[PDB]
Amino acid sequence: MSDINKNSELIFIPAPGIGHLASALEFAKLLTNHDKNLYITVFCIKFPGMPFADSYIKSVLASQPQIQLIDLPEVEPPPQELLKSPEFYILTFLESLIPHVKATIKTILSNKVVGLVLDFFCVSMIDVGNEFGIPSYLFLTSNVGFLSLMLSLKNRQIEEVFDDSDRDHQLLNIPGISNQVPSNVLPDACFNKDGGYIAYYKLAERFRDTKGIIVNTFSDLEQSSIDALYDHDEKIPPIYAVGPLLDLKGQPNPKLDQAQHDLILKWLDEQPDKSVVFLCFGSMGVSFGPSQIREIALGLKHSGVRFLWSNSAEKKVFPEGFLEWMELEGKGMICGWAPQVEVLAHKAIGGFVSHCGWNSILESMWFGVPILTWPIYAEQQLNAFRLVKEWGVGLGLRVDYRKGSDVVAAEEIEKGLKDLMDKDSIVHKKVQEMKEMSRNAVVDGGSSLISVGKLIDDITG
Amino acid sequence: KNSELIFIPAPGIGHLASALEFAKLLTNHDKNLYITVFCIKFPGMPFADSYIKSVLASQPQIQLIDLPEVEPPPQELLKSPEFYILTFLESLIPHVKATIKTILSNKVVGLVLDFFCVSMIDVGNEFGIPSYLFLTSNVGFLSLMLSLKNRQIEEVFDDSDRDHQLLNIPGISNQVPSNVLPDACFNKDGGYIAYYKLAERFRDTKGIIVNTFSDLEQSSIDALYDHDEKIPPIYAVGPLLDLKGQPNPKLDQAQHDLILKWLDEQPDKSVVFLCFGSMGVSFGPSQIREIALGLKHSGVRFLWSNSAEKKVFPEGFLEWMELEGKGMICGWAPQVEVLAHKAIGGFVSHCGWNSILESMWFGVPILTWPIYAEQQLNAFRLVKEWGVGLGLRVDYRKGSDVVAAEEIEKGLKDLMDKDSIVHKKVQEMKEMSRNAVVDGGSSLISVGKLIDDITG
Ligand SMILES: O=c1ccn([C@@H]2O[C@H](COP(=O)(O)OP(=O)(O)O)[C@@H](O)[C@H]2O)c(=O)[nH]1
Numbered sequence: 001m002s003d004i005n006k007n008s009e010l011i012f013i014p015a016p017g018i019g020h021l022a023s024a025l026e027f028a029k030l031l032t033n034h035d036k037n038l039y040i041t042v043f044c045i046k047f048p049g050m051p052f053a054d055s056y057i058k059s060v061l062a063s064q065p066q067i068q069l070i071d072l073p074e075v076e077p078p079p080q081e082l083l084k085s086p087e088f089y090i091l092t093f094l095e096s097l098i099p100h101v102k103a104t105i106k107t108i109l110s111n112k113v114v115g116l117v118l119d120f121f122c123v124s125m126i127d128v129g130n131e132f133g134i135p136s137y138l139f140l141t142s143n144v145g146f147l148s149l150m151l152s153l154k155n156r157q158i159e160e161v162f163d164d165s166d167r168d169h170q171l172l173n174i175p176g177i178s179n180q181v182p183s184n185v186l187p188d189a190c191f192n193k194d195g196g197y198i199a200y201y202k203l204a205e206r207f208r209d210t211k212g213i214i215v216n217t218f219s220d221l222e223q224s225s226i227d228a229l230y231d232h233d234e235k236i237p238p239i240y241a242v243g244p245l246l247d248l249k250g251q252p253n254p255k256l257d258q259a260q261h262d263l264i265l266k267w268l269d270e271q272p273d274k275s276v277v278f279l280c281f282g283s284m285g286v287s288f289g290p291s292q293i294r295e296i297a298l299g300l301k302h303s304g305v306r307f308l309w310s311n312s313a314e315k316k317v318f319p320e321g322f323l324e325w326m327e328l329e330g331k332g333m334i335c336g337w338a339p340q341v342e343v344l345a346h347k348a349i350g351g352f353v354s355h356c357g358w359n360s361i362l363e364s365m366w367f368g369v370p371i372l373t374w375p376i377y378a379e380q381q382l383n384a385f386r387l388v389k390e391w392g393v394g395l396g397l398r399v400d401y402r403k404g405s406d407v408v409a410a411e412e413i414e415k416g417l418k419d420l421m422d423k424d425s426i427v428h429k430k431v432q433e434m435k436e437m438s439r440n441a442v443v444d445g446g447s448s449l450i451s452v453g454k455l456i457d458d459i460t461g
Numbered sequence: 462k463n464s465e466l467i468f469i470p471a472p473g474i475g476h477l478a479s480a481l482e483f484a485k486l487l488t489n490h491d492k493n494l495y496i497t498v499f500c501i502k503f504p505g506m507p508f509a510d511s512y513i514k515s516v517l518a519s520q521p522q523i524q525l526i527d528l529p530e531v532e533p534p535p536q537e538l539l540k541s542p543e544f545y546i547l548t549f550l551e552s553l554i555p556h557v558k559a560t561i562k563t564i565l566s567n568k569v570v571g572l573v574l575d576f577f578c579v580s581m582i583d584v585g586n587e588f589g590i591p592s593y594l595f596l597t598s599n600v601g602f603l604s605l606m607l608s609l610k611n612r613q614i615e616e617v618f619d620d621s622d623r624d625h626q627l628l629n630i631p632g633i634s635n636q637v638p639s640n641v642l643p644d645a646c647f648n649k650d651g652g653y654i655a656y657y658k659l660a661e662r663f664r665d666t667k668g669i670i671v672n673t674f675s676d677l678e679q680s681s682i683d684a685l686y687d688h689d690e691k692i693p694p695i696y697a698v699g700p701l702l703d704l705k706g707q708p709n710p711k712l713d714q715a716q717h718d719l720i721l722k723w724l725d726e727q728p729d730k731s732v733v734f735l736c737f738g739s740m741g742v743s744f745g746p747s748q749i750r751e752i753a754l755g756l757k758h759s760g761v762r763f764l765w766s767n768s769a770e771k772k773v774f775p776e777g778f779l780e781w782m783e784l785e786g787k788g789m790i791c792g793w794a795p796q797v798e799v800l801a802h803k804a805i806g807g808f809v810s811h812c813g814w815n816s817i818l819e820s821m822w823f824g825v826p827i828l829t830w831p832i833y834a835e836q837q838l839n840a841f842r843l844v845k846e847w848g849v850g851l852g853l854r855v856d857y858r859k860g861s862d863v864v865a866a867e868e869i870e871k872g873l874k875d876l877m878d879k880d881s882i883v884h885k886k887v888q889e890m891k892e893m894s895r896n897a898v899v900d901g902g903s904s905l906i907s908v909g910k911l912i913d914d915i916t917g
């Protein structure tokens with residue numbers, strides 16, 4: 001009787017791709033590690049023309065008796081024309097899977113199922129859960145900063161898209177974020193009149209219908225933001241900080257063979273401690289244009305810093321002689337896909353030019369690597385802004401860069417690199433302190449484990 | 462039977478030169494016509510009287526008078542070049558008025574004012590002297606200016622809300638894209654106001670003289686008359702060109718000769734000349750690197766005039782030029798002598814009007830890269846109206862993002878493609894250019910009519 005009574009089940013419905021999947025799987029593992037009678041079923045969605053399928057997930061899970069996965073049938077992808085807004089495209093694709101989600105839940109339903117854990121983009125699934133009397137929990141792969149922005153959309157109408165006019169000078173007061181936020185660091189979606197704003201609006205609208213909001217962040221980083229949100233609107237469900245949630249091993253990717261993988265780390269072994277700058281801009285596989293790539297190459301070479309540069313640019317694009325020089329001196333290396341967590345863990349890495357995706361930020365924080373910000377899409381500009389202006393752990397190259405921005409010149413890049421690699425940088429002390437705080441969050445008795453315990457109690461009670 | 466005209470060109474040798482060629486043209490056609498040119502020194506820059514006597518050729522019928530210099534306007538106004546210049550010239554009214562009164566006689570028959578000096582028409586009015594507008598630009602620019610009257614004084618063109626907005630301007634056949642309008646039209650810091658204030662006086666002049674020719678824009682002139690009877694007579698007296706080029710800085714021609722010798726060594730019509738005006742502001746480092754790569758990869762031979770520091774160029778670029786000799790870079794260039802050179806087969810130009818006229822005169826095709834003033838408009842018409850040029854960009858302006866090497870290379874190859882459609886129109890435009898200024902040609906007939914109107 002006691003055993004039956006203790007068994008509980010959660011159904012996870014994460015968004016496609018690493019960046020959304022990694023933390024969600026690590027979360028499923030954290031949960032099961034803290035309740036032997038907690039079982040989880042992960043619905044695996046197939047995104048049109050995209051990797052990170054079963055292979056990746058099973059690799060991450062690496063055997064877990066309390067976690068099983070079920071693939072959802074493939075459905076017709078939405079029209080490409082809707083890509084005028086990635087966010088709206090994603091929302092449309094996910095809502096198209098509602099019928100299959102309902103059908104799959106009906107097939108594995110039992111009376112021990114106590115809830116759904118949904119990604120930000122899958123909140124429409126809340127209604128499906130209600131059909132079965134199953135409550136839903138929001139699992140946010142971003143931070144409390146992004147949550148604050150989404151929760152603020154309630155005070156406005158779905159037709160009032162953010163002004164794309166003078167965002168070069170428009171400070172906004174967003175409850176949750178202490179600093180006035182420059183309008184030019186808001187996500188592209190907020191200004192998108194072709195579905196972007198509508199998508200953000202429609203999703204944020206469902207946030208308050210969840211039984212709880214779980215965030216991949218930690219108390220020492222955003223407790224004041226969480227407190228600020230409550231002090232503003234008590235209608236917000238309970239917020240649980242259970243991070244950092246990271247995949248510290250990394251999983252195999254086709255764009256990186258074992259030989260390539262091994263050589264990168266061995267090359268790093270040969271470099272002086274904290275002398276190498278790592279450059280990586282996410283998992284989307286879309287590089288900067290030719291001119292911009294040339295400017296980065298020249299800036300890197302002119303700075304004299306050693307580097308590991310991950311990019312998918314064609315060889316013909318590089319400045320004449322650059323690649324020859326690079327492999328002649330061996331002062332730098334280029335790869336198509338990097339074993340990021342192993343790189344950030346290496347003693348040779350002294351800096352990280354990042355696109356500021358949240359997982360990449362958490363990883364750099366966990367390893368105490370300083371970041372030179374170069375945001376591009378999603379909420380990366382907001383993350384860059386806070387890293388530089390709020391937490392003071394990063395240096396700004398650009399905090400408002402986005403698709404359509406002008407090319408960043410080699411001279412400006414060279415300047416950022418020198419400041420980043422400066423041993424006497426002021427952010428150095430802050431980064432060291434942030435490393436300690438992120439590590440302590442997840443040890444026994446740390447803020448995140450105390451939080452996960454209470455979350456599990458709330459879920460299964 | 463002497464008559465005297467007072468010329469007041471805009472500050473700077475660029476304008477002093479254009480005004481002098483015009484003074485020469487008029488005096489050459491009326492032995493009893495004398496011209497007095499008021500020289501105004503641009504805030505700061507020297508150019509005192511070096512180029513003056515340089516191209517003077519001791520013309521008995523032409524005299525130069527230097528007006529005292531005055532405190533230039535505050536640097537803060539530089540947010541709008543046009544408004545800055547306008548303010549400067551207006552502060553010169555007292556001196557202009559005093560100088561006219563000192564040389565006034567029953568023989569003075571009129572004032573010839575540059576575009577930026579048209580507000581001086583009030584000074585001429587005080588002495589009962591008629592004012593003529595002298596445009597160093599073309600009838601397309603005249604058309605745009607005259608159309609400003611259909612707007613308000615604070616209507617700075619929909620607040621740069623230009624992207625697809627098309628405009629119908631009398632005098633210009635094609636609907637004009639809002640993105641090829643001069644920076645001043647969108648400038649809310651005084652640019653639009655300056656243009657509006659000057660244009661507002663165009664119809665008050667006794668006649669409008671333009672550096673252009675009938676075979677090029679007669680239809681635009683006809684459209685204008687047909688659209689507004691208040692427009693005074695328009696006289697096309699160009700091309701007005703200095704076929705000798707600014708001699709000074711004259712120091713026996715060290716760098717000069719270096720340039721011409723290099724060109725003498727290249728195959729005929731194999732060289733692309735790149736030159737972007739006389740204002741001196743160089744494209745930024747990134748853009749300079751993209752032009753360098755584009756040129757090298759394209760395979761064309763080239764003579765590139767620029768003011769970039771040597772350290773900015775792509776690594777290996779400078780060495781390559783010196784070793785393979787396919788191209789070379791220089792600073793200030795003897796542009797007319799270069800365009801006249803048989804080695805030149807193409808010209809990447811900022812599309813300033815004098816550069817356009819000089820290129821048409823020597824039959825050299827242009828690949829357009831406008832930057833400021835009415836250059837985008839000039840570029841637009843060169844490509845879409847006259848077909849004598851190829852467009853790299855027609856809407857480029859300060860603030861535009863870098864034009865990549867790939868795009869430049871494509872432009873260079875099309876420009877140097879002997880089967881391009883521009884080459885045929887170019888030869889014809891060359892003939893029409895030359896024919897405009899010979900006896901019986903349209904511009905000399907116009908000159909006679911103008912002198913008759915002036916001294917009549
Ligand atoms: O070349 C790469 C690029 C990215 N990543 C990993 O992919 C995830 C990227 O997530 P993030 O939110 O930082 O950016 P996103 O790709 O979602 O825009 C992180 O775990 C990175 O460590 C990696 O391992 N190698």
Ligand SMILES: O=c1ccn([C@@H]2O[C@H](COP(=O)(O)OP(=O)(O)O)[C@@H](O)[C@H]2O)c(=O)[nH]1
Pocket residue numbers: 475706707736737738739740766792793794795796797812813814815816817819
């Ligand atoms: O390096 C140079 C650049 C320009 N010019 C001359 O300077 C004048 C430029 O006039 P334009 O209206 O074409 O451009 P602007 O300099 O007024 O913007 C023309 O006579 C060009 O031939 C020259 O001789 N050498």
